[PDB]
Design brief:
Elements (H helix, E strand, L loop, with lengths): L20 E3 L5 E3 L3 H13 L4 E5 L4 H17 L4 H8 L16 E6 L6 H11 L5 E3 L6 H4 L7 E4 L2 H10 L3 H7 L2
Antiparallel strand pairs: 1-2, 3-4, 4-6, 5-6
Bound molecules: zinc ion.
The site of zinc ion has 4 residues, from strand 4.
PDB class: hydrolase
Keywords: Vancomycin resistance, peptidase, metallopeptidase family M15
Assembly: monomeric
Length: 181
């Protein structure tokens, strides 16, 4: 199924992967197929007094490289050699071609700041996102399977059916897909 595509360090985005993008009010772009589900999610959060924003949706190859390089630089400044910094940065930011952001199926969701804090939004997403087809992609108890640190902002659309099962069983996407055989 299209919404269950696996992208990670071992599963690059296919060459010639087509995505039709829609622009949100803030200029971030998403796969048009997830648009109503993301809108429903945001509508529900706001009905609960929780006010999120899409900090980052779709990214081009060059954008992903720039974000990765900026993370490498942050490590270099904290006392890592370039090689150490690259390896450490990858636990947060994927090498170009291996980010879900390049699918259009992932959004980094933050708080608006003024009505909600980060932790309020992250908590609401953790407890509710699956009802709209999104999963907390990189949970803190699955870093040894996903290869990614706790990123409570990063939500991936898989569809309501899969998201609900993933949530109830406490899985990451890799486990879910493996268990489907
Ligand atoms: Zn992200």
């Amino acid at each position: 199924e299209w919404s269950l595509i696996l992208v990670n360090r071992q599963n690059p985005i296919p060459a010639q992967y087509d995505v039709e993008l829609e622009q949100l009010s803030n200029g971030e772009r998403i796969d048009i197929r997830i648009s109503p589900y993301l809108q429903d999610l945001f509508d529900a959060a706001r009905a609960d007094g929780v006010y999120p924003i899409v900090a980052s949706g779709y990214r081009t190859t060059e954008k992903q490289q720039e974000i990765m390089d900026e993370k490498v630089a942050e490590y270099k400044a904290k006392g890592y050699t370039s090689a150490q910094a690259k390896a450490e940065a990858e636990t947060w930011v994927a090498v170009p071609g291996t980010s879900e952001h390049q699918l259009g199926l992932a959004v980094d969701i933050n708080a608006d700041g003024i009505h909600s804090t980060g932790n309020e939004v992250y908590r609401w997403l953790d407890e509710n996102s699956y009802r709209f087809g999104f999963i907390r992609r990189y949970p803190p108890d699955k870093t040894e399977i996903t290869g990614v640190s706790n990123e409570p902002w990063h939500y991936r659309y898989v569809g309501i059916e899969a998201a609900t099962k993933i949530y109830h069983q406490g899985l990451c996407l890799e486990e879910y897909l493996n268990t489907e055989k």
